[PDB]
Design an enzyme around this catalytic site. Structure first.
Site, PDB file in Angstrom:
ATOM      1  N   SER A   5      -0.807  15.461 -12.234  1.00 52.13           N
ATOM      2  CA  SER A   5      -1.228  15.189 -13.520  1.00 52.13           C
ATOM      3  C   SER A   5      -1.600  16.212 -14.560  1.00 52.13           C
ATOM      4  CB  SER A   5      -2.460  14.015 -13.891  1.00 52.13           C
ATOM      5  OG  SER A   5      -2.762  13.530 -15.112  1.00 52.13           O
ATOM      6  N   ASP A  32       0.838  -1.176   0.011  1.00 50.61           N
ATOM      7  CA  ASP A  32       0.050   0.058  -0.184  1.00 50.61           C
ATOM      8  C   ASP A  32       0.927   1.241   0.140  1.00 50.61           C
ATOM      9  OD1 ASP A  32      -1.897   1.988   0.358  1.00 50.61           O
ATOM     10  OD2 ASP A  32      -2.387   1.561   2.476  1.00 50.61           O
TER      11      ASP A  32
END
Ligand SMILES: CC(C)(C)c1cc(CC2(N)COC2)no1
EC number: 3.4.23.22
Length: 330
Positions: free
Chosen positions: A199, A35
């Site tokens: 992004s 994770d």
């Protein structure tokens, strides 16, 4: 040194991925959920409340000759979905795919919430976010990666998740046969303890690319892709009959639909998520309503590039003094 381990989806929908981890002496092998969105290594154990263990493999520190109780240390964590676990801490030898860390904090669960109990395939989590998020008190502990970093050939690990297939976590090296084209690297902020990046935008199917900054985290421990409501609305508008359902808890769509791809930007580069990756199947057995793999982050506080996005790429988690993230097509 290096390590290399296969990671395997826990079910036919890629709801999560498990990786074998060797703990203690002699080795006890547990299948853990790697994770990058948390920083505790915790396991079902011989100390876990009996009624809260249902099929998991447990760590028994009393059977490990290298286990040492970390005196006075406790831990308690709650995750984004409302699940939680807590207990005490041992240090022990931990190995992943041939890479060994001695004196790793292994957090032994005394309590786990129902969702963990109900998932017989996951024996614990191995956190790979930054050690500033580690919940051990009163002395915060380092992640497996943090501990291993100095000994690694290169201070990196890579995530290569499969679509309905096994994949690979590598430590200490970049496998140049595992991706196509070049890797595009992008800046990371560690200010919230996550692999947080920006992004450069998105496209829906064959549609035009929208240049827009989307801040979010690279998180292997999250199944779906969570993005701003504007973006997610634009995606599902291209699917006939798709809609957001408050009763189901997100966007659903007719199982007869053909989903469009979703493209996200990494600098000037583009990663394409095929439509099939975004299908998470009937909402309940036999239903013709299917759950969508792209969901709104509106009620989260942060955008999350989970497995749906990451499995479409070869991802480099560069833990240099100034960390960065690399994405390549594959
Ligand atoms: C959903 C997100 C924000 C990724 C998330 C991560 C977590 C676990 C932690 N509380 C943060 O590191 C330990 N809970 O929610």
């Amino acid at each position: 040194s290096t390590g290399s381990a296969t990671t395997t989806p826990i079910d036919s929908l890629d709801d999560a991925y498990i990786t074998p981890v060797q703990i203690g002496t002699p080795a006890q092998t547990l299948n853990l959920d790697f994770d990058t969105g948390s920083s505790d290594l915790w396991v079902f154990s011989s100390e876990t409340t009996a009624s809260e263990v249902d099929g998991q493999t447990i760590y028994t520190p009393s059977k490990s000759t290298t286990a040492k109780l970390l005196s006075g240390a406790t831990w308690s964590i709650s995750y984004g979905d409302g699940s939680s676990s807590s207990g005490d801490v041992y240090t022990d030898t931990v190995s992943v795919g041939g890479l060994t860390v001695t004196g790793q904090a292994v957090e032994s669960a005394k309590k786990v919430s129902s969702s963990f109990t109900e998932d017989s395939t996951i024996d614990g989590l191995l956190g790979l976010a930054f050690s500033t998020l580690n919940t051990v008190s009163p002395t915060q502990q380092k992640t497996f990666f943090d501990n291993a970093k100095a000994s690694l050939d290169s201070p990196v690990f890579t995530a290569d998740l499969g679509y309905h297939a096994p994949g690979t976590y590598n430590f200490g090296f970049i496998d140049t046969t595992a991706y196509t084209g070049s890797i595009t690297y992008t800046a990371v902020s560690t200010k919230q303890g996550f692999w947080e990046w920006t992004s450069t935008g998105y496209a829906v199917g064959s549609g035009t690319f929208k240049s827009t900054s989307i801040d979010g985290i690279a998180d292997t421990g999250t199944t779906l892709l969570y993005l701003p409501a504007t973006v997610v609305s634009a995606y599902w508008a291209q699917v006939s009959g798709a809609k957001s359902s408050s009763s189901v808890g997100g966007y659903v769509f007719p199982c007869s639909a053909t989903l469009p791809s979703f493209t996200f930007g990494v600098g000037s580069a583009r990663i394409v998520i095929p439509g099939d990756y975004i299908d998470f199947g009937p909402i309940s057995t036999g239903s013709s309503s299917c759950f969508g793999g792209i969901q709104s982050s509106a009620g989260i506080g942060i955008n999350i590039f989970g497995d749906v996005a990451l499995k479409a790429a070869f991802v480099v988690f560069n833990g240099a003094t100034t960390p960065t993230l690399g994405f390549a097509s594959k």
